[PDB]
Amino acid sequence: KVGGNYNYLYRLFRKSNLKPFERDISTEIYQAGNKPCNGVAGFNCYFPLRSYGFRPTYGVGHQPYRVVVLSFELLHAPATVCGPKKSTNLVKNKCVNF
C-alpha cells in the first residue's frame, strides 16, 4: 500500500530461540534488563512484535515475499495422500499387459 501496509507483524526479540515447528503468539514486553517491566515500554523493556512498512517504492529485497513450505510426513500410519496415475487402452482380441 502507498501509505504502508503495517498489518503484517514479525517478532524481533525473544528469550531463547524456537524449536522445530513452534509458534509463539504472546505479546509480552521483552524483559531485556534486570528492571522488571510493568507492562509499559521504554528503557530495557521493548515490544517484541514490530510491523512491516511494506510500500510499493521499496526495492526487491524489502518488498513483500510470500513463502510456503510443504513438509511431508511418513508415519507408520497408512498413506492417504497419493499422487496421480493413468493411461488409456481397453485393447481387445490381443494379449497385452494389464
Binding site: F13, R50, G53, T57, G59, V60, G61, H62
Partner: protein, 592 residues
C-alpha cells in the same frame, strides 16, 4: 546480564525504528522536491521534526552506555555514532539564541543586494563577476557586496562564533573547529587510529607539496591577465580579489577565456555530436549504467528507472533542479536533475550515479554506519568516475567522438589547464579559509584583528590582495555561502586529494600505461572489485583502513595529485621562465 548484550539489543531496536523513520522523512522530502507545494512542504517538515525528535530522544537514552564496557568494536562504534548529542547540549535559551542568529545570517545572505544598477547575488552579481572584464565594473560590485553583507553580518557573526564555541565546549570539546575536525577522527588498532589534532599537522604538510604547482599556475595567470589589465597588475605582485573570475575566488574556471594555452585548438565538446545521433536523458543514463557495470559494479535497481526523476517534469511541476542523489532506504535510490543533452550534464550524470553506487554498497552495514568513511570520501568516489568517463578514449568507445580523431598535445595541455584552474586553484583558497576559521574559533586571532589577519593571510597563501582597504568594520569571511550558512569547508581539500588518490590507486591496478589523466577504467573488472572493497565498509571501519584498502596508505597523499598535472606542470615551468614565480606581500592596488 552483561551490558554488551543490552547495548546490542538497544541498537537493534534503534536501527529497526530508524530504518523506518528516516525512510519516511526522506520520502516526504522527495515528494516535496518533486512538486514543491505548501502541503508537501508541511508534510516534509513534520516528518523531519518527528525524525529529529526520535533521534534526539534515542541519543539522550543512549548516553547511559559508556563505551568502556562495550567490547565488540562494531557495537561500540554503533553506540558512539549515536551518543554524540551535538546542538542539544546547550540550554533551551542558548539553543534558541543560536538558531535565531543562524537564521538571521542565512536570511541576510539570501536577501543581499548591492546597488551603486540594483541587482541581487545570483541574478546580476554572479554573471557580472564571471563574464565582465572591466576593472571598475567588477571592483564596485565586489566592494559593495563585501561592505554590505560583511558589515551586516559582522555583529551577528561575532556572537554566533561565541555561541558555537560554547556549544562545542558543552559537548566535551574545546572549540567549534575541533567539533568540525571530529569527522576525521578514527579509532581502531595502533595503525588505524587517527586523532583530530593530527589533521592540523597533515593539511599543512599536504599543502607545502602543492605550493610549486600553484605558484607556477598563479604566475601564468598573472602574465596572461596583464594584457586585459595593463594598469592593474604588477609583474611581481599579487592578484586583486575582484579579478579572479568570482566574487571570492573559490574557482578560477571563469578565467579560461583570458588564460588559454592554445586558442587555435579549443576544447572538445560532444554536445553537437550527442544531438546528431538523437540521444536523450534516458540514453545518457543508460550509457552511464553501462560504464558503471563495465568496471564490475552491481546493476542499478529496477526502481531507479521508474520512480526516479531523471528529466525535467513537463506536467508543470516546479523542481529545485540541482543534481542530487537520494538514497531513501530499503532499496530505494533515485537521482533528481533536469538532465539534458549537454556535455557538462552528461558528466554530472556519471558523477551523481557514483553517489548512488556508493549508497548501494554500504547498504549491508547497520543503519548507524550507512555513510562514507568521512565527509571527504563520499564526494570523492563520484568525481573519479567523471575523470575516467570524460577522457578522449572513452568518448570514442561510446561513439561520441569519431575514430579518425587523434589525441593532440596542445588540446591535451588546454584540457589540463582548464582542469587545474578549477582543481588546483580551489585548494589554496579552501586551505586558507579553513586555517583562518580554525584560528578564529580557537581565539588565537583577537576579535580586534579579524579582517587584518584575514587579508594578511590572503596574501601569503592564496596570493590575493584587496583593491581597497578594509579595516575591522567589515567581515569578508562571512560574505561566503559556507561561512554564513553553517557548513564545513575543509571537506573540499580532503575530497580533492582523495579523488586523485583513488584515481591513481585504481588506475595502477588496471595496468594502464600512460598519463594519469588519460586513464580509462572501463573494460576492467579488477578496477571495480578493488573499489567495492572500500565502498562496502562505509563507516564500519576507521577511514584509515578504508583508505588503505584502496590506495594502501593510511593518510592523505598529495604525490598522486602532482602526477595528474605533470605534463601541464612542465609546460608551465617552461613557459613561466621569463618571470618570477611568486609574489611579494607588500604590493597594494589601493596604495600609490
Amino acid at each position: 546480564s552483561l551490558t554488551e548484550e543490552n547495548a546490542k539489543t538497544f541498537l537493534n531496536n534503534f536501527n529497526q525504528e530508524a530504518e523506518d523513520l528516516s525512510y519516511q522523512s526522506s520520502l516526504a522530502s522527495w515528494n516535496y522536491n518533486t512538486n514543491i507545494t505548501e502541503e508537501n512542504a508541511q508534510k516534509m517538515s513534520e516528518a523531519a521534526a518527528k525524525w529529529s525528535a526520535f533521534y534526539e530522544e534515542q541519543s539522550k537514552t543512549a548516553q547511559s552506555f559508556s563505551l568502556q564496557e562495550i567490547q565488540t568494536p562494531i557495537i561500540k562504534r554503533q553506540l558512539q555514532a549515536l551518543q554524540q548529542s551535538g546542538s542539544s547540549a546547550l540550554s533551551a535559551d542558548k539553543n534558541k539564541q543560536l538558531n535565531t542568529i543562524l537564521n538571521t545570517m542565512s536570511t541576510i545572505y539570501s536577501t543581499g543586494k548591492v546597488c551603486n544598477e540594483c541587482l541581487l547575488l545570483e541574478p546580476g552579481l554572479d554573471e557580472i563577476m564571471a563574464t565582465s572584464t572591466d576593472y571598475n565594473s567588477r571592483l564596485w560590485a565586489w566592494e559593495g557586496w563585501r561592505a554590505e553583507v560583511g558589515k551586516q553580518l559582522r555583529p551577528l557573526y561575532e556572537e554566533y562564533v561565541v555561541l558555537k564555541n560554547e556549544m562545542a565546549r558543552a559537548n566535551n570539546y574545546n572549540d567549534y573547529g575541533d567539533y568540525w575536525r571530529g569527522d576525521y577522527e578514527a579509532e581502531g588498532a595502533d595503525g588505524y587510529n587517527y586523532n583530530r589534532n593530527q589533521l592540523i599537522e597533515d593539511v599543512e604538510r599536504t599543502f607545502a607539496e602543492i605550493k610549486p604547482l600553484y605558484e607556477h599556475l598563479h604566475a601564468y595567470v598573472r602574465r596572461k591577465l596583464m594584457d586585459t589589465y595593463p594598469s592593474y597588475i604588477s609583474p611581481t605582485g599579487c592578484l586583486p580579489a575582484h579579478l579572479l573570475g568570482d566574487m571570492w575566488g573559490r574557482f578560477w574556471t571563469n578565467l579560461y577565456p583570458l588564460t588559454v594555452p592554445f586558442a587555435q585548438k579549443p576544447n572538445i565538446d560532444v554536445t553537437d555530436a550527442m544531438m546528431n545521433q538523437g540521444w536523450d536523458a534516458e540514453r545518457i543514463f543508460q550509457e552511464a549504467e553501462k560504464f558503471f557495470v563495465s568496471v564490475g559494479l552491481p546493476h542499478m535497481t529496477q526502481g531507479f528507472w521508474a520512480n526516479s526523476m531523471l528529466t525535467e517534469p513537463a506536467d508543470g511541476r516546479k523542481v529545485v533542479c540541482h543534481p542530487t542523489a537520494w538514497d531513501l532506504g530499503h532499496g530505494d535510490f533515485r537521482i533528481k536533475m533536469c538532465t539534458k543533452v549537454t556535455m557538462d550534464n552528461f558528466l554530472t550524470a556519471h558523477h551523481e550515479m557514483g553517489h548512488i553506487q556508493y549508497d548501494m554498497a554500504y547498504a549491508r552495514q547497520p543503519f548507524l554506519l550507512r555513510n562514507g568513511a568521512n565527509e571527504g570520501f563520499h564526494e570523492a568516489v563520484g568525481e573519479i568516475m567523471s575523470l575516467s568517463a570524460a577522457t578522449p578514449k572513452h568518448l570514442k568507445s561510446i561513439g561520441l567522438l569519431p575514430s579518425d580523431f587523434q589525441e593532440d598535445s596542445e588540446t591535451e595541455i588546454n584540457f589540463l589547464l582548464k582542469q587545474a584552474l578549477t582543481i588546483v586553484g580551489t585548494l589554496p583558497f579552501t586551505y586558507m579559509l579553513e586555517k583562518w576559521r580554525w584560528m578564529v574559533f580557537r581565539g588565537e586571532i583577537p576579535k580586534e584583528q579579524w579582517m587584518k589577519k584575514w587579508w594578511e593571510m590572503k596574501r601569503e597563501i592564496v596570493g590575493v590582495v584587496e583593491p581597497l582597504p578594509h579595516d575591522e568594520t567589515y567581515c569578508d569571511p562571512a560574505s561566503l555561502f559556507h561561512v554564513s550558512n553553517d557548513y564545513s569547508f575543509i571537506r573540499y581539500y580532503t575530497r580533492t586529494i582523495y579523488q586523485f588518490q583513488f584515481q591513481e590507486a585504481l588506475c595502477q591496478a588496471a595496468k594502464y600505461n600512460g598519463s594519469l589523466h588519460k586513464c580509462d577504467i572501463s573494460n576492467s573488472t579488477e578496477a571495480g572489485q578493488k573499489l567495492l572493497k572500500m565502498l562496502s565498509l562505509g563507516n564500519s571501519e576507521p577511514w584509515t583502513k578504508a583508505l588503505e584498502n584502496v590506495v594502501g596508505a593510511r593518510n592523505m597523499d598529495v604525490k598522486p595529485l602532482l602526477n595528474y598535472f605533470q605534463p601541464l606542470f612542465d609546460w608551465l615551468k617552461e613557459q613561466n621562465r621569463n618571470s618570477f614565480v611568486g609574489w611579494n606581500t607588500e604590493w597594494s592596488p589601493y596604495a600609490d
